[PDB]
Symmetry: none
Amino acid sequence: ESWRTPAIVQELAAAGVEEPPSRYVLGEKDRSDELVAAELPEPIPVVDLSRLAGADEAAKLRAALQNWGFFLLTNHGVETSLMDDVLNLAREFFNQPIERKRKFSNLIDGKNFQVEGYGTDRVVTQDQILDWSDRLFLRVEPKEERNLAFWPDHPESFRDVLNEYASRTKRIRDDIVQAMSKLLGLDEDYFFDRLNKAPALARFNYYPPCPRPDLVFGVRPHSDGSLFTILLVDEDVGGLQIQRDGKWYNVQVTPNTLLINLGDTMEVLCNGIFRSPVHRVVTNAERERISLAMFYSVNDEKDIGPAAGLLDENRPARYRKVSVGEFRAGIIGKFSRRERYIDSLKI
Amino acid sequence: DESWRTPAIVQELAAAGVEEPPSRYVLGEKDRSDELVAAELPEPIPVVDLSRLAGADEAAKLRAALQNWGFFLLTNHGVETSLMDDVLNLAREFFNQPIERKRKFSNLIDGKNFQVEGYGTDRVVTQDQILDWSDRLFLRVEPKEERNLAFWPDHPESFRDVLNEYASRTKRIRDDIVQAMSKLLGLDEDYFFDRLNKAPALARFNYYPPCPRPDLVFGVRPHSDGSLFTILLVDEDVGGLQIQRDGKWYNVQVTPNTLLINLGDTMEVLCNGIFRSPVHRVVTNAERERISLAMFYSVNDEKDIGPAAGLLDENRPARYRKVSVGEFRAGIIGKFSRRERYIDSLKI
Ligand SMILES: O=C(O)CCC(=O)C(=O)O
Ligand SMILES: O=C(O)CCC(=O)C(=O)O
Ligand SMILES: [Cl-]
Ligand SMILES: [Mn+2]
Ligand SMILES: [Mn+2]
């Protein structure tokens, strides 16, 4: 539409067009020698969850979070069948006649936008540049505010499998949070008063093949606004890239393994001892890419600011203190305008 | 100096022979008031015969122990006398080694980086944290995927075989106790067993050295266990374990070759406070050391920890909040460091 109903990017790829529409083509500064990325100069940071209680593993986590802000997780205890099934739901739901899929459109009545549903993100302005990907955004926790009406019916086990996956990742959320609290010198339960009744958001990404991968981004360069994200990818074959010291690095998520990356809230909360990585996804011209991201956010208990226990007067606050509503307003708000909120809070 | 993150081996401090504990072990005046001399049990220690726990007589003895005390002694427990002696010999022979042979298995990795598993004490979070007058060797025996054999000691040479054998006996005990208590609650005997597969089992060998000022320190601070159940074995108890009931402190001597079972905080939550997990502590003495082994049995991450649905109705509301297993565990461990009781933050 004009800008009220952006078209589903999967239908633009199935049109067999050789060029993308003008609303998807980036600028010259964003299309400079960046999309041709390198690969990590060292073995990709890998944390073994089943051994994270040991100080050896906790030091591997520390180096991952200090150097890169993300890592791959192994021996995480999520069954291979469950990871295959939850990704089969996205595979099955996305690979559907579109009349079936439009029933869960995040543009209710075709004109009013919301975050929860199937489609793309918010289009504030007509000249805004749109990503070459579709999404299915679902709030999974707390279960009391779960909007099942937008949860797809096909396959007929979507709610059960996604709920099962949500309860598996909970243990991963708890273990990693406990580990980092010890790494930061805080109480190992420090972060759990901020997680009671906290939002858990599931994002099903469909990056369709693009005839011109040089002109578009699967998702724009960005850092997550969560505490951290668990990422699950279906036979990655590439596309995800992460930035470190200006340079984009190609990161491939090995099948049956999970990628954990930090969000902007964690960087502020830990005063920037670990940082939230800025990342993006590149499209390819042959095959599509489906990923499931689980965002774990903080409740409205306390304001988002550096932890009291990480600040003496010789380690002052590098970041401001803002409310939860102000924080979330800007991660979403600055995502559309292609800026990074957390820079504005840095002192 | 930040050397306070590298806590001393208390057994070494005790061998210094000086007249006072260092100030970091000294309790506040409130903790040292008219408690440390406890009272004697007004009734005999509750005792349960495991071999007859399927019978009404013993199971009723089990209920009275759980409702009134939260703990009981277990007889005919299936653990041979030689095996209890063997597992306590591990503790005796390991601790009575030169500090250089024990330090290989320190939980302070590279001398700096704390982890739970190993020989030392519990996490030192702040400089002003009061420390306990004891060392412990903490070994993760289950699940085997999380087992780290490199911290299981090389002395005596039977350590892995003996502890494995003992733990398999105490696991059986755990199953029997869970079943029996399930029937007490009117639940199916297997109601909780979906929480017991690939669940943590932790062995804690405690070493309480003598202290020149037993009036000033705790061998271990007042606490309830975070487990479902705890099975405790003490080497010739001589004395020191104290348990609290309704604000009063009582001495409890774990008779040799018997096992003390106490209910843990996880069970208290799961049974909605029908039975409660008892607060207990160890006081030191000036003459001799005390050795005990505690097997903590926890739950997996199948469900969040909360009151069992079979125990709730309109006139039986839930008395505890529901929290995830990892959140529960980190709260147990964190609150222990701060001298606070985690389960009270879950009470509704
Ligand atoms: O699809 C990926 O690999 C990245 C997903 C991502 O960054 C997101 O959903 O926020
Ligand atoms: O040593 C005792 O008698 C008590 C041990 C104990 O409470 C523990 O290890 O948690
Ligand atoms: Cl239940
Ligand atoms: Mn992201
Ligand atoms: Mn205890």
